[PDB]
Design a protein around this ligand. Structure first.
Ligand SMILES: Nc1ncnc2c1ncn2[C@H]1C[C@H](O)[C@@H](COP(=O)(O)NP(=O)(O)OP(=O)(O)O)O1
Ligand SMILES: [Mg+2]
Ligand SMILES: [Mg+2]
Length: 430
DNA sequence: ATTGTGACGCT
DNA sequence: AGCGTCAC
């Protein structure tokens, strides 16, 4: 009752770019706009691998991971843009730079946590208080929320999508208690107003559209964001959680999409997030550990404490290449040449990072995968990163991995290498 | 023959 | 440190 905290202390948003790499390519090439199109990596094997899909193409069943030749079977008019290739490998620089455009705009409004190349969490608690005191008890007009959905509404006692959106928004705004600067629902609503402004700024200043979730924590904000993609934002209130979670598959919640979530389902014999409420905290800790158990106990009630971390920049800079099937590396000169290619791309990125961000990486991580290993990475080893020099970095990487060659003759490499990876980490101010 | 990333937990 | 999980 009076002492059960409800996880309503913060306003958190998650902003996620719509079909991001496609929008980057559509901005550059107007011929691709408003078309079924996808972004592909490589081309020789089965037309290349799709990594991003416009919503028009999704209507035909085109998905990420699909080979372009197969996507063309579903959508013969599908347009394609290829990822740039440099030093024999896909190079993601255009999309990293477009990401920086977006992240810098978001940072004007509040502290952000860069969660991926196309999404960031925003802690809007302080901006909301500021806007509430600036408002001074004035009601919030539906005109300030032109792309907002209120999850769970309309309910209780039109057949077009926009009409239903507005009905739900009207119900929400009519029930709002604007006199209380401490009402969590009012705080979320003001947060949604700010996120409308943020998303309008992103679109105006970059051309890119995005979706967003607004709630009281990161997990609910991320879940909310997906409910009404594309080009829309969704408010998930604390009160909306019991109905929303009552039919929400456990795998849809961030961090439960893999083996842990499958074990929750298997061990407890449940399917939906809401069913977790019927277990004690101790029961959940007994099955999934102290940390996971406490997290699940609170999360299924809509409560999570994970902070929005003040971090706009990636904390590692990595370069990797797969060598699948018959292309696996089997000679010493091959391994050396590709380590050099990776190191040269890495040195380029690291030198730019040092100039832009006043920091230097101090550790080099070298990872490989050998033919036959089902795991993604076979061995990882670190060494010192003291100079941004590609030849030195590639020589050091080879020195670190050379004992992995089981071949008697040095000139060959056994077993063949199906992946190389160089990662710069452990950044220090400079 | 997904690929190229990137954050964080465990021991 | 080196390995595993999870999601982009
Ligand atoms: N498995 C993968 N491998 C490589 N690149 C990937 C990838 N998954 C995504 N990307 C790249 C390409 C993606 O554009 C970008 C952001 O990933 P999302 O936010 O998961 N997906 P998007 O923004 O395309 O669509 P929407 O958010 O509207 O559903 O990261
Ligand atoms: Mg996205
Ligand atoms: Mg994303």
């Amino acid at each position: 009752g009076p002492h059960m905290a409800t996880g309503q202390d913060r306003v958190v948003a998650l902003v996620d770019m719509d079909c991001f790499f496609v929008q980057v390519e559509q901005r550059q090439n107007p011929h691709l706009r408003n078309k079924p199109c996808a972004v592909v990596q490589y081309k020789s094997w089965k037309g290349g691998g799709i990594i991003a899909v416009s919503y028009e193409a999704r209507a035909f069943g085109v998905t990420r991971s699909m080979w372009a030749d197969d996507a063309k079977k579903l959508c013969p008019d599908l347009l394609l843009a290829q990822v740039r290739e440099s030093r024999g490998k896909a190079n993601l620089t255009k999309y990293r730079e477009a990401s920086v455009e977006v992240m810098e705009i978001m940072s004007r409004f509040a502290v952000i946590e860069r969660a991926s190349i196309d999404e960031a969490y925003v802690d809007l608690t302080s901006a909301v208080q500021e806007r509430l005191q600036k408002l001074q008890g004035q009601p919030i007009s539906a005109d300030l929320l032109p792309s907002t959905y209120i999850e769970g509404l309309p309910q209780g006692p039109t057949v077009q999508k926009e009409g239903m959106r507005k009905q739900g928004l009207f119900q929400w705004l009519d029930s709002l208690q604007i006199d209380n600067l401490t009402s969590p629902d009012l705080q979320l609503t003001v947060g949604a107003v700010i996120v409308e402004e943020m998303r309008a700024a992103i679109e105006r200043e970059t051309g890119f559209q995005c979706s967003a979730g607004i709630s009281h924590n990161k997990v609910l904000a991320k879940l909310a964001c997906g409910l009404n993609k594309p080009n829309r934002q969704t408010l998930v209130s604390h009160g909306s959680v019991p109905q929303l979670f009552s039919q929400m598959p456990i795998r849809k919640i961030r961090s439960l999409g893999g083996k842990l979530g499958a074990s929750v389902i298997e061990i407890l014999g449940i399917e939906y997030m809401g069913e977790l409420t019927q277990f004690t905290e101790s029961q959940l800790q007994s099955h999934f550990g102290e940390k996971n158990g406490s997290w699940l106990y609170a999360m299924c009630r809509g409560i999570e404490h994970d902070p929005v971390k003040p971090r706009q920049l990636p904390k590692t800079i990595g370069c990797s290449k797969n060598f699948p099937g018959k292309t696996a590396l089997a000679t010493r000169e091959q391994v050396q040449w590709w380590l050099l290619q990776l190191a040269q791309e890495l040195e380029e990125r690291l030198t730019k990072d040092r100039n832009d961000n006043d920091r230097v990486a101090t550790q080099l991580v070298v990872s490989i995968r050998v033919q036959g290993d089902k795991r993604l990475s076979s061995l990882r080893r670190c060494c010192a990163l003291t100079r941004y020099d590609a030849h030195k970095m590639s020589h050091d990487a080879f020195t670190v991995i050379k004992n992995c060659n089981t071949s008697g003759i040095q000139t060959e490499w056994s077993p063949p290498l199906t992946m190389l990876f160089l990662c710069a980490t452990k950044f220090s101010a400079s």
